[PDB]
């Protein structure tokens with residue numbers, strides 16, 4: 001696989017886990033676009049920047065030199081060379097990230113970072129196969145029921161299922177504009193499947 005594989009989908013549909021495993025099986029990096037959006041949100045919070053102040057936020061992001069590090073075991077985001085990854089997957093970041101991700105300048109900043117990577121790679125996000133890498137040779141859209149996505153996510157947050165579900169429903173709703181599947185994406189419902197099964201299906205499709 002020498003081109004680009006995109007994997008898009010709503011929260012907890014399985015994108016990061018599948019992209020990591022598929023990329024490792026193909027011998028290429030994977031790029032988690034949401035990690036950059038999460039970093040943008042985390043930095044704005046930490047800096048006391050008003051979430052509607054695009055200019056100030058962009059001044060900060062470019063000013064700090066924020067970078068995505070694609071490592072096989074998982075992506076990392078650095079700001080001024082320092083690893084912020086451990087702070088990006090909190091309920092707090094989950095709850096405010098959509099508001100920051102809606103800013104045109106932030107999306108343009110994230111996409112510039114993604115476009116700096118030479119192919120091949122597998123990229124996961126909301127609009128990888130539509131807005132960012134529409135030329136991708138292999139596109140996938142993962143989806144599952146809100147209940148199972150909330151069930152999966154609750155295992156990864158200091159929150160119970162019902163709150164996780166409420167939060168997930170809201171976030172996916174707030175992400176609607178950037179979340180439609182590419183028309184040529186293979187849509188897979190991952191509910192009821194193991195990570196291994198989804199990876200196997202995706203690789204089989206890629207290797208058709």
Ligand SMILES: Nc1ncnc2c1ncn2[C@@H]1O[C@H](COP(=O)(O)OP(=O)(O)O)[C@@H](O)[C@H]1O
Pocket residue numbers: 009010011012013014015016017018152153156190191192193194195196198
């Ligand atoms: N069939 C599956 N496919 C992918 N991930 C799964 C699956 N079943 C359970 N998981 C768990 O659900 C979580 C999904 O997280 P993640 O890979 O980040 O998905 P997403 O990027 O869509 O939020 C992981 O904890 C993963 O281990």
Ligand SMILES: Nc1ccn([C@@H]2O[C@H](COP(=O)(O)OP(=O)(O)O)[C@@H](O)[C@H]2O)c(=O)n1
Pocket residue numbers: 010011012013016033034035037038097098101102124125126127128171175178
């Ligand atoms: N390409 C994408 C990727 C992420 N995002 C935003 O970034 C936030 C986090 O993405 P994420 O993929 O890390 O979230 P999860 O699906 O991993 O739970 C999201 O809710 C989206 O608002 C986005 O607008 N567009």
Ligand SMILES: [Gd]
Pocket residue numbers: 012015016017034
């Ligand atoms: Gd993820």
